[PDB]
Every structure is written in C-alpha cells, then in structure tokens.
Structure prediction request, 1950 residues.
Amino acid sequence: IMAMTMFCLYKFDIESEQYKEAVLTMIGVLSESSDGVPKLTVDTNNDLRYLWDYVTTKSYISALNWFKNEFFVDEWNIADVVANSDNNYFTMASERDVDGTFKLIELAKASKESLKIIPLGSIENLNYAQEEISKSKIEGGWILLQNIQMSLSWVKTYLHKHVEETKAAEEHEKFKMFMTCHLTGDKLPAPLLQRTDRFVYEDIPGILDTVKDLWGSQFFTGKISGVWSVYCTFLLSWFHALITARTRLVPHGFSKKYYFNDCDFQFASVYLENVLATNSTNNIPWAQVRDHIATIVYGGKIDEEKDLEVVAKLCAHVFCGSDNLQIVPGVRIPQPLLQQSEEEERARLTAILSNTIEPADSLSSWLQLPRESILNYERLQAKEVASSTEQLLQEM
Amino acid sequence: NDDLLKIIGSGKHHDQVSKFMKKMFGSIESIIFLEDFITGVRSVEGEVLNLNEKIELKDSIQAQEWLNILDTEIKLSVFTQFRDCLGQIKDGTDIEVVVSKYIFQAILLSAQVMWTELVEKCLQTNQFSKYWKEVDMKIKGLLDKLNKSSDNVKKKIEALLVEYLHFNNVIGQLKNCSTKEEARLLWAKVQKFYQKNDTLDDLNSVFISQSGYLLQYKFEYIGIPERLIYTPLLLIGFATLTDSLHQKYGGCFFGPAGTGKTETVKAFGQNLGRVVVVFNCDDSFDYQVLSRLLVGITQIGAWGCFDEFNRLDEKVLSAVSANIQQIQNGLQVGKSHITLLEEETPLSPHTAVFITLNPGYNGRSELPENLKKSFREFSMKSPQSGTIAEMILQIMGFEDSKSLASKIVHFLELLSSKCSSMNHYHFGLRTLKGVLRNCSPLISEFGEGEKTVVESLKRVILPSLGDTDELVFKDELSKIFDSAGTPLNSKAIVQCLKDAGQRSGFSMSEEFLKKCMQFYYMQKTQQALILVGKAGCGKTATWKTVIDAMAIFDGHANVVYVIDTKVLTKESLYGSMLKATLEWRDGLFTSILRRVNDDITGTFKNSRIWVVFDSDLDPEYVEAMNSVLDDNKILTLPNGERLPIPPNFRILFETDNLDHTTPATITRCGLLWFSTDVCSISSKIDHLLNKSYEALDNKLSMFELDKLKDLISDSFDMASLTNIFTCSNDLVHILGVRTFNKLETAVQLAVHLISSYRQWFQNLDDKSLKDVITLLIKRSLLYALAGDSTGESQRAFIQTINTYFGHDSQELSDYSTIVIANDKLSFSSFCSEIPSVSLEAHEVMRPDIVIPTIDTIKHEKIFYDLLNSKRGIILCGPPGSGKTMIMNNALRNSSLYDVVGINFSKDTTTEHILSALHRHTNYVTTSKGLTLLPKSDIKNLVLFCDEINLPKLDKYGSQNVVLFLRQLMEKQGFWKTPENKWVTIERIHIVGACNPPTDPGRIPMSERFTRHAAILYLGYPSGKSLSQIYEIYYKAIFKLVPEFRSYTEPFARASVHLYNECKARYSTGLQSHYLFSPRELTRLVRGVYTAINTGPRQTLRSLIRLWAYEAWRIFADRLVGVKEKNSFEQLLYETVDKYLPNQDLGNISSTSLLFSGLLSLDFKEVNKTDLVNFIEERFKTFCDEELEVPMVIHESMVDHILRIDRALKQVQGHMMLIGASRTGKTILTRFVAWLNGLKIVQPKIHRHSNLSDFDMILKKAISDCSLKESRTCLIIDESNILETAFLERMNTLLANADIPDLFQGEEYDKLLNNLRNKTRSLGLLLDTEQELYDWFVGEIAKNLHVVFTICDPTNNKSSAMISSPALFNRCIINWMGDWDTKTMSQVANNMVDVIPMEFTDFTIRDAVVNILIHFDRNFYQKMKVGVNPRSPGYFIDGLRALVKLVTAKYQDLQENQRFVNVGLEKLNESVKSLTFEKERWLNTTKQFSKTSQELIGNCIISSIYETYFGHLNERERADMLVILKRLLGKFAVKYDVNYRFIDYLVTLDEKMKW
Ligand SMILES: Nc1ncnc2c1ncn2[C@@H]1O[C@H](COP(=O)(O)OP(=O)(O)OP(=O)(O)O)[C@@H](O)[C@H]1O
Ligand SMILES: [Mg+2]
Prediction:
C-alpha cells in the first residue's frame, strides 16, 4: 500500500498529466473502481507500458510488487534494521501463524551472540524475567521477551515504568532487548510502543520447508515407540504442514482464518502413539485415526460445517493409504519395509524430503484446491492494496 | 468464614451442620443420625444413602474430624452399593428388582459395566440381535414399572431410562455396521465403563475408556440428577473433554447460549462419579469467594466449571485468568505444591478447570492469552434433532419411534424451507419438543401412533401459521404422512361455541369458528396463550367466546382479569420493593393470585381463572414472569418468595405485534396468529346494530324500539355499502385507520341519529320517513369513512355515496341538514343557517371567542353528534385550524357536558391524567360497581387531551398514556396503581386533538387505540373566510377608533394578504421555524387592539403604522439574515399600496417605526432621538444600580429593547432570542426586565446539577408568582437545559402555565391550602376546587415570563428548543444572529474614542475601524466553515487589545523620546573630540518620527495575533497576516515591513524565563 501510494506521491508532481490518468486508470483496473485501457503512445512511456503488461496478463502479485522495484531501494532485512537502529529496545509483532523467535536465534548467532529467550508464563517467569532483565543490561547480553501480550497487565506496571526509567540503558553495555507481539491481539500501550523500535516478521515458510521443520525436531524426543510410528509421525508432519498452508488462503480455501499450533501436532501425535500402543502393528487401525484427528484434535476449533468437511477430506488423503500414498504430486511415501530398521526409516523419510523440490504452482498442486481459486485470491489482495491507495490519495 | 464459624459453634448440636453440607458437597442436602451414630446422608434430590459403618460421635469430637470420615465412608458406601448390585445383575437379575433396593448412582454404574462387558463379547460373536431384544425388553419393562411407581423412585427410573435407551441405541447402530471394523470404530467413540478384575484400592477399581483414553471413576456421591439425553454430539463433547484431560489440559467449550455447555461438564463429571462445582461468573460474584473456592478445588481435587467465563469485569478477569494458569500449569508440570493467592498450597492432580464461553455481540468469545496454551477450545453446536426426537418418542410409548422421528423432523425441516420466512416462525427442535410434549395427552385420546403425532403437529404448528403457509403445512403433512379421516371432540364443543356466540352477538364464520377451535384445543395443553393480530381482528371476541362456551360444556365458571400490561409499571404489576426500608407491598399480577393460592375462601377450586394482558408485551415484563412460562409453574419474587400457580389459572396475551419478544418466550407459550379478521363486514354491522339496540332498551319503550329497528333494516342493504367501503380506500385519509375499524363509528352514529328523531316518526309520512332515514344514514356513513379526509375528498365521496345508494333516495349535499320547528312539530330540509356575532373591543382576544362560519357550525354539529353516541373523538388537523375551539365552544355552550383540559408533552404520565380528573371527579363506593369514578357534579364530563400524539414511547416503542386512554375507552374502567383495585368510570368522555403525524415532533398512534375514535380532519379556512373572520375582529376593535370604521375591511384583507404571502415567501425549506397559521393573524389583530386601547387618538397614518409595527413583530422578527428581511419590507410596502392607498406613510422598515410606552403614558410612536437619550439615562442607572457592565447603545439595540419590552408586557410573554454570542442578548434581557420591574431569576445550574435542583428553582419561582405576587422573569440559557427532562419541564411551563408534578399529592394539598389563604386575602372566595386552581394557573400565566437565549440554533440541543412545540407556539422568536457592518463600526468607534493618535496621509480613526471590520470579515470568510453559526466576538476583544497596546506603546515611545531629550541637554552643557558625533544623534532623533508613524498599524497586527491567531496553524497564521498586511497596505496606515511578533511583544528577559 505504501509502495503504490508513495510512487504516485512522487510521479504525479514529477511526470506528465497524461502519465497521471494512465497509471490511475490502471490502479482502477486492479481495484474494482473501473476497467480501461490507458492512453497509448509510441515510446511515449516505457516503464508504464511494462506495468500494464503485468495487469493485462492477469498476474496480480507481480503488478503490486512493481511499485516496490520502482523505488530502487534496498528493502532492509530485520538484521540491517536492528544494526542501524540505535536503541536497546525493539518490539516485533507478527501473525499467529509464525514467530520470529527462531529468526532472532540466527540473528544473534551471526553477530554478537548473547541470545537469552525468556518466556513470560506464570509468576515465576515474570519474576525470573525481571531479574534477568536488570542483570543482562549490566552484562550486555541480548534478551527476548516471548509473547508479552499475554502477560500484559504486568507491562503497564513494571515494564512501562522500567523501560521509561532506563535512560541509563544507553549508558549500559551494548545490550538489546526484543519483545514479540501478535498483531491480531491485545493492544500494547501506545507510549511504550512509540518509544520502542518496531518490526513485522512477514516471513512465511513453504509447505515442504515446514514439513522439514516439523520432522526436524522429532529425532530429539528419543525412542519410545515402534519403527512403524515414525511413519505416522512423518504422515502428521505432512498433514500439519498442509492445513497450515491452507489457513492463510481464505476465503478461498478455508472459510475463516483458523490458527493451528504446535499444540495441535502434539495432541495429534499423542493420539497416534496411543492408537499404536493399544492396537496391533497391523495397518488397518486407520479408520478411527482419521475421525479423531479430523473432528476432535483439529476439528475442535472449527465451527463452520463447510470447513469441517475440508479437514476430513485432508485426513482421507493423508491417512488412509495402502502401499503408496503420494501426499503431493511428486512425492510418494511407501509404508515401512519388512527390514524394520527404525534408524534406516528415519533416514529414509528424511531422504524423501531432500529428494523433492516444491513446484511453482504449489498452493494449487499440493493443497488439492484449484488454480482458479488461487488466482481469485491473488486478485482480491490486489484489490485491497489498490483500493486503500486510491482512498489515501483523495484524502490528501 | 461466617458459615464455618457457625459449624465450630454448632458443634454441641451436630445436627445443625447438615444445613452447610449442601454447600460443601453439592449432591447431598441433609445428614441422617441416630444421634450417637451417623446412619447415612440424603441428597438434594431426595434419595437416601446409608453408610456401611455408622460413624460414632462423642460430644468432645471435632467437626473436621467426624466429617472427614464421612467423605471417605460416603464414597466407600457407593462402591459397596455398586459391587453388591453389579454382582446381582451378573447373576441374571431383572433390573426392575434392583431399582427398588439400590441408590441410582450405584445401579447406573452397574448397568454401564455389565452393558459394556456384554457388548464387548457381542462384537466378537456378532450376536447383537439376541442382546438387543433383551435390552429392548428391559426398556419396556422399566417403562411400565414407572407408571405405577412412587414419585421418589419415579425420578430414579426416568434417570435410568435415559441410559438404557443409550445402551440399546448403540447396540442397534452396531447391529447395522457393514463390517466388524465399522463396529470397532463406532465402539471406540463410545464411553465404555470398565472394571478391573485384577486389583485392590477398590475406589480406584472402576475406570472409563473413550477414544483410546482412560479415566478413573472417582467414587463421589452424585445423587439422582436430571440426566441429559445421549446424543452423538454429547459423546463428541465427552470425547474432547477426555482428550484434554488425558494430556493434563483444561476443557473449554465456546458457543451460543442454550447449547448446554455447562450441563455437559456437569454430566461428564457424573458419568465419572464427580460432582462438578460450577462458578456462575459475573452474577455480581465476589473475587474473594472464588479465590477461596479455587484453593479448595485444588486441594480436594475437584472439577470446576466456569459457567459463561466471558462475562467477567476486566480487573477480575485478569486476576482470575492468571490464577487459573497456576492450576493448569501446575498440573501439566505436575508440581506437588503451587502458589496462588500468595500462599503455598498443595495441588491434587485429579483437579481440572473447565471454561464455557458464551458469545458477545462482537463474536464468539476467546480465552485470555495465557489460557490459550493451557486449555483446548471446542465448538458446541445445537443437536441435530432427529436423535433427540427418536428417544422422546421411545419414552412415551413408541409404536415406530424411528419412523416418526425421521418423518416429524423431515416435515418440520420441510416447512422451514417451504413456508415464507416469517418472524415468529420457529421450526427448530424447541418446536418439535413442544409437538412431542403436546403429544402425551393426545396419545391418551388416540394412540402411540403417527396419527397422534399428526394431530399434535396441527395443534401447535397450525395456529401460528398464516394463510399462504397454512396450505404448505397441509400439503406437506399429507405428503410425508397420512393418518386419518375424522376428529374427536368435533360436534360437542362446536354447538357449545355456536350457542355462546349467538348469545354474545357474534357470527360463526369460517375463520371465527376456526380460530375459536384452535384456541379451545390449546388451553387444554398450554397454560400461557398468545393471540396476535391486527387491531380489530377478533381476539377479545375469540377468547371471550371460547371461555364462555366452556362454562356451558364443562359447567366450570371462569374468573377473568383483563389487565393492560404496559399501563402499569413492573413494580405496579409484579411487586415493588423500596430500596431502604425493604417494605414489600403486593402489586397487581401477584395480588390477584393470592386470592386463589393464599386464601381460596370462596369457590376457586371449581372455577377457571384467566388473567388477560391486553397491552403490548415486552421482554422486561415477561422476564419478570418467565418462571410461570417455564415448566416450573411458580412465581418468583424480587425479594421474599415463590408462589405456585394452579392448573385453573391461565395467562393469556392479546396483542397486535411481536417484534420485541424473544423466540424463547413464544416457544414456552401457545401462539395463535390471526392472519385476517374473523368476521364479514356485514356480520360486524349486524352485531354492532344489536349491541346498540340493547343500550336503547334501557332508555326507550319496546314499541318505539321495535319500530326503529325495523326502519334501519329496510333503509340500508349490504349490496350498496360494499362499493362505498371499497371506494373509501381509494381516498387519502389523515390519521389512517382501516375500513373495518371505522364501522363501529357508522352504526353507533346512525342509530343515535335515528333515535334522535324518534318522536317525529310516530305521525310522519312513510315515504318521507325513509327519506329522513336515508339522509341520516348517508350522513353518518360519510364522516365514518371520509371524516378524516380532506373534505375536498369529502365532497368527492359525497357523490360516491349518492352514486351507490338508490338513485331516487334523498341525495347528500356538502352542508345538507334536516330541520324541525321551534314551537310546533314540523318537517323540512334546510341547510346552513347562522347566528350573527357582534363583539366589543375588549372581547377581541379571549381564549373562548368564536366567530361562527358555515363550517364552524358544520363541524360543531357533527362533533356534538358523535359525543351523543359517546364514541371518542380525534380531531386531527394543522395548528390554528380551530380543532380545539370547535370542541370547546360546542361544549362551553351546553349544560349536559363539562370540559377538562389536559395538555400532553413529549414525556407526560398517566397519573397527570388522573390528577387532572381528581379535581373535577368524585369516587363513590356503591356496591353496584364497587368503586366507580363519576364526575364530581351530576352531568357528563369530557376530557380534552390536547397533543395526544406527543407523548413518547418506551424504547421498545409503546406509549402508555395512549394505552391508558384506550383502557378507558374500551374497558370503561381502570386498575388503581397503588391501592390495586378495579374502578369503573361512569359517564366520562375522551376527546383528543392532534396534529398530522407527518408533522415534526409527532409520534405514530396505535391502531388499537384509534379504533375507538371518530376522526375528523379539520383544515385551514378559505383565505376568503380568513379575510371575513378578521373583518369582524377589526370591526370589534375599531369601536375604539370610530372615525376609521370604514377601514376595517381593507385592514382585514391586508392582514390576510400579508399572512398568505409570508407563508409563501418564507417556508420550512429555508428555515424550520418559518411556520405560519391563522394564529399569527389572531396575534396581529390582538396586537393591534392592545396598541389602540392604550394609545393616543389615532390618525389613519397612525393606524396603518400601528398595524405595520405589529406586522413586523409577528411575521418578521423570526426571519434570519437580510435577503428575507428585506423581502418583507417590500411586501409590507406592496400590501399597503394594494389595500390602503395613501401618500402619508413614511419609512415602514422596523428601524424607523418605533412604538413605545416608556416615554409616553399612552402607547405611541416615539422619536428616535427622544428614545436613545431615554435609554442612555436608564442604562447608566441600571449599570449603577445592578451589575456593572459598560456597553455601546446602538441602532440595533434600541429596536431590540422595544421588541423585548412588548413581549414582557403581554399577558403571556415568552420570547426566545437567537443571538450568536456576545451580541448582548443576555444583558438586554436583564435590562428590559428591570424596566418592567421584573425579578430576574437565572437558574444556577452546574455539571453536578440534578433535575431536582432545577425543579426547586422552578417551584419557588412559581410559588412566588402566585402566592407572593412576585412578577419574575426567568432567563433560561441553552446551557441550562442539561437533559431532555429539563426542557420538558420548560414545556409544561409554557403549554400549560403550571408544572403539574411540582404540586401533587400532599404538596398539592399544601398548595391548595395556601391558595385559599391568599385568594381570600385579595378579597375573592371561590365556590369550587376547580375555581381555585384556575386562579393559580392564571396568576402564573401573567406574572412569570420566560426568555430563552440560544446562541447556535444549529446545535442539536438548541435545535430541540425551537423544535419543541410548546416553546415554539407560546414564544416570540426573535433574531439577532449576527452583527452588521454598521453596528460593528458603531461599537468600534466608541471603543477607540480615546485618541492617542496623530495626523496621517489618508481620516485616521475612520481608517483603523474600517480595517478591523475588513479583517473580521476576512477572518470568518477564510477560516471558519459551516453556515453562519458564529459572529462578532474576537472583534470586541481585538479592539480592547489595541487600546491596551497603543497606550502601552505610545507611553513607552514618549519615554524613550524623553530619554534622548535628557541626553541632548547633557551633551550641550559639556561643549570634546568624540562628543560631537554623539550630538549628531539626530539620525535617532530623525528616526523617531518614522518609528511613531508605524506604531498604530503595528499595534493592529499585535492585537490581531493575540486575539484571532491563538488557535491557527503555522501556515494559517502567516496567510492571514498577508491579508492583514495588504489591508494595512490599502489603508494609509504604515507598518514595519520587517516585523516579527515575537521580538515586538516578547522581552529577552521573559523569553529566557519561559
Ligand atoms: N363473529 C363476529 N360477528 C360480528 N362482529 C364481530 C365478530 N367477531 C368480531 N367482531 C367485531 O370485532 C370486534 C372484536 O374485538 P377484538 O377486541 O377481538 O379486536 P382486536 O383484534 O382484539 O383489537 P385489539 O387488537 O386492539 O384488541 C368486536 O367489537 C366486534 O364488533
Ligand atoms: Mg381488543
């Protein structure tokens, strides 16, 4: 929105009047205000002639990013921003789908180390927290305050005064405090917010990448279950990464934004350990595995009947499957071999991830929803950016 | 603490602990002893549990010690009763045997364990059918046992039935499975109750499996609770709860209210032998108590449910939510001890927290963030009904329960898709539970077959359907299932219904029989009945007919109580409690029940009691009775009690709409929708006639009666009238009422008009007789259909009547009348004869003066005729149309009726009506009607309710004051608000005037009230009658100037011309207050008289100017701006030239004609020079004597002083001044009031002022005006009106001249006493109570004078002032909205009168003032937006800044010029080498003249910065400065080009300090 706006804020004063109505009749096409073909002159404008080519090719995401490239700016990486920034405080909000907690780990590792993750949980965590805060500034270590919004009542009393009083934090050793927020969620005090630097973690992982990230930790748990189980834990890895991928695509996709957690995976895997623990190793237990995953574990938060069918139809494909599953078009998962090596099978199932590379059309090929729905969605988020910019121009 | 102390204290007794157990256990109510020994405990349900070991007690034993043993033994005792029982059933024992000896909790668990065991093996063998019948038989066996059982064990069987149905249902489902895998899937979803045949610790022996997860049954007593029917949905909820608990997480379900989320958590507990503690959150619930209970739950290891957690207050919610985290975080980790409420308390791992989340207006609620990773949220949904339906059918006596449940649901579901979407239609399960509930008595009549279901569908669903949907029901009912041909109770009721209606007057039509049948069948089943329909549908007729037919058929009498629901308050009706003394008095609804319940002294047992609510029904009132509408059938008091209602006592609701009521309220009651009127137009008439004839029998001989009823029948036939009523619709009706309800108006009139001429029907010609009849009937028919019509339409309809009636029959004329002789019986038809009026000068304005017109007589006759009928009248029409006078003069004349005037305001109460009646009415306690309320004198009384469409309506939208009148009109008696008894009003009439409700201020009236009124729309007259009427007005006042008696007509024609033109030129399209009527004319004519009656003998040039003055004050003072104001100047000129052609007139503008009685003893035109000087000498005096404030007396102000003066002189003097701000409107008012010798009262309001404060301010000012003869002038500013009511009080003080409320009850009696004292002191005793009050009010009207000062009429609160009718009509609106350029210059000049200045280029003073005006004109023109709300203020303060700044700068310029002159004398004394440069210092000396040139214009800029700039932007200031500098450039004033506001007024010492 700020791209398209600032582009028109510059070029309307700088370029021709014929330029003005041409680009505006284009921004009108991206929005549902109007549809037209702009005024066309041989060699008259070439950058503008290149833009309409994006809009006429029904390619929406491309035409929206056009205005970003036209700024000719290095779009600053949270690291660069932090490095430039000259304050010991930062609040980075983000959507509930992701958390930049793990981005901060690699940000600290690559420069200055000193990573300290601090959950604000109960009295103990806030109480330990306030102790680790006063000591880290003297030490100069980095600190993170995970999900403050929940512990907020405390913020207005202890943190609001504490951060305000600490003008000696400038005097104190190189130290940097970070706080994670959620944009959809409890509203932070404005005065504390204005004092502290702000970032939005907008970095969304691909399906395959999230599968690899789910499966990655799973080896840390040890070994307590069958070799066969690791196959079901692999199945769930794909499943969870497939519904999370669907969560963002709405309305086309899911009816509302639903949030699914690492808690949802945990409650699902717990049920899986339990079904394999209470049944024989025969594959056929599969029937009530789907029902319980699709209606209690994940279908719990779902309230709309439309969407409850979608979670079920995902379980239909991810869980029931004899000999070959074929989660995605390219990748087939075969059921455990007779050799029954549990160490081999981990490595085999990791290898199947390393073999595949996520296609261009992933959201339509992998999430079995149609291509025409994805375009419908691309069109709508285009319309939202284009609208809000026109609104902004006329307001000033 | 307090309860606990009672237990430690009550130890001696022991038995007194049983009270407190109910709390600390939840299941049990009281404990059983053998005194030394505890034999057992009994539950809140009534079930008796006996322990294994009776616990021994001694006196010196502690409660804590003995009770702790009981908790342990109570659980053990349940295991014992469980194993004992389980073992029995295992040994092939019929369940009917077991029930009689084992507690429910035990038997339930035993069933579950054996069931589970028996089905577990049955999955392997697939022997389902063998086990199924087996189970099915136990079900039937239990059912028949129940019918013959003791109420206590009746609970136990029913509770078990819920379970056995579950058993068989699951087995049947299992029989049906395609394969064995299918069966193992279904079985996994179910709650399977296992026992360990392995092990010790028996309390821990029973466990429960579901979805693979296990959960140990704790052995707590549950008693015998109401067990929820098992649904798939219920199991899924159980399954989510078990899935959360298994992983040590909290259970949480969100969803819409009525989805049973807490009931689930209660049940999920029970299934596992746990009594869940439910916290109803935010029912004004303390945090301190909850914090205690949370510690107890973590110690005792119980389950807590937060019932509607969402509803907590943010401070509480934070605190609670944080605590809950401790518990759930303690569990997930498993910490042995956790800290909460800042103390170390231990945590049982059996503990769980459950949260139910009702949705807000915004959405389905959420858990606080911290709780999100501690709980598991789930979505409760209403149960798909089919499953509930089947079980319910199973319990009653099934037949085929599966087919009915599928079929009923399909049909209900089908109706929903196939009927119209109508508001009150509910085809939700609530509805099928109701069909099913209604089914049980029905089964008794017929069968446990579909046919009984079919009938119950049409018993419930059909009475609420409307004609289109009524077939859809019938079409799809037969489409889904066909049952039978013939109905029971078909003949017997029907002849009892026909016989009741023949007696009542009614006609048994298709529909009237139908809705009578629908009703009869419903009272049977339903105890609360609703009747919904249009006003005049037939409801009162339906129920009054059916109820009457039941006393014929049963032999049971009825006792009906018809109460208007919304006339009385919730406190007047249910029971009102007083906050401090807590004194409880009965009410109305509750007090009539105490006759039946508390003391059935006479016969109530064999009687049927019906309490009818005739008024509109709303949530607040039904919610206060919802418990009677519930399955409870008991009344719950606000404080003190529950009163149970018998089966005789039925509550009916007749109303016109439902919009307000909740779907929950409908579905508890039986709803009877009246799609259309029960009865035919004709049939209505028929009944109406006969109803009218019965009244006459009491006052007319049978011979007379027999003959007159014969006449009516042969004169009017239905065939003719049918077209007449049809044509009635093709007509524009003011105050619209439907044809059908207008009928009573015809027949009641018609019969009275014929009973009028009864004597002349003895000897008159039989052909001629018919002509008298037909004429009357054609007349009465006209006003009843077209009376509320334009009359332009009446005339048109008159021909329409004539058309459709027989051609030969006496035709109707506009003014057609029947006439008989003064001294001899005669007969002839003549119309329009008028008595001729001559009135003296003094008579001219009087609240009771009528100059009769062809039309005044026409209306006054019809108006009087309707009252003879005694039908209520609504005179609807424009303001000044004469609706009040026509009503008043027709009755001020006759001996029969006596009028009583009530004015209604936006918020008037039903008590004000009563208090106004009490003044002219006397209650008599005659045993004939019990209490009655006739008039205080023998002959008939008429309430005149003026502005009847003014009182406002409940937020629901229901005006009670109107419903009260409706009560009086229809019921003829009302219920006493405090004393609670029926008083039947005798011989009292209701008449009302209202404005068209298309007019602003006006409220739409309920058809249920206007149905009992005859409506006559009276409009404005002619423009040629108006000319004629005011001729007679001028004729009367020109008795005082007989030399111009020939001038009355062109004055009357001119006045009317001026009126017609003002009304045309200045409309409500330009300004809202531009509203003219013949009241203006009357204002003008009287305004003219008062000038004459107190003026010098008059020349023709005088009188036209006298007339012109009043013309200005009446028509043009209200005019805004100048384009319109000048338009009137030209109009006034145009009118005199057209009607009074003279060359003797002068300047007719208001500024040039100034008339006053301040200078002369006689009201005369005064000299401008003579007046200004007179004001000047009196203002100094007023300035000296009163508050010291100096001002400039200017041309506008003199004109305005006279305007206020005239206002404050007239009997009723109300002027509202519209002056922007600082115009001086408040100061002039104080002045002119002081000249007139008025006490100036100004309400001392403030932010923390109550209505009571203002009430006091008002009351005093009123009491002083009458009982002290004070003569006060009340100045009310727009700021003083803090609420709606404050302005309403001001209205009551102008529409009437008293505020009723201030003096009521005892304070009425004290006023009344004091009134008699002063009246006699003055020397007049007044015969009656009415004679007294009218002195009081009249005294106020002439001594209290209200002036309003509103600044921005654009403001919505100040708009409401001008809007208010009371204020608009009785105030003189006056406009001062802006200072004109001339008045600005006048004021500017006198402020810069002080002359520091010296000669400049070009006048110097003249230039300065012209700049400031041109700056103020440019400031508001550039900066301010919006249309002319704001005016000269900064201008005054900008001039005041300049004066202070020039004086400060010129005295400092002359001070520095004196500092260089003193240095000039000192250097000349000395004269060496450098000092002659110092002498040269004439550059500075030369410089001074240039410095002084610019200081006047520099002060201009500095003053403008201080005043105009303070609130302007960086750029806004700079830009105005340029416009100021270029204004300084046009005018020959010099300014500094390099000028800086900071450096010019800030000093470096101060700039540093800041
Ligand atoms: N069968 C009938 N024959 C003749 N007239 C009838 C018949 N039924 C009803 N009426 C007329 O209609 C009127 C019915 O009164 P009712 O109070 O039922 O109307 P309503 O719809 O309840 O009005 P509201 O809603 O304002 O109470 C009666 O006065 C009567 O004149
Ligand atoms: Mg009625």
About this structure: The first strand of chain A starts at residue 89 and ends at 94. Chain A touches chain B at residues 121-123, 147, 149-153, 185-186, 261, 263, 266-267, 270-271, 274-275, 278, 284, 287-288, 291-292, 295-297, 300-303 (CB under 8 Å).
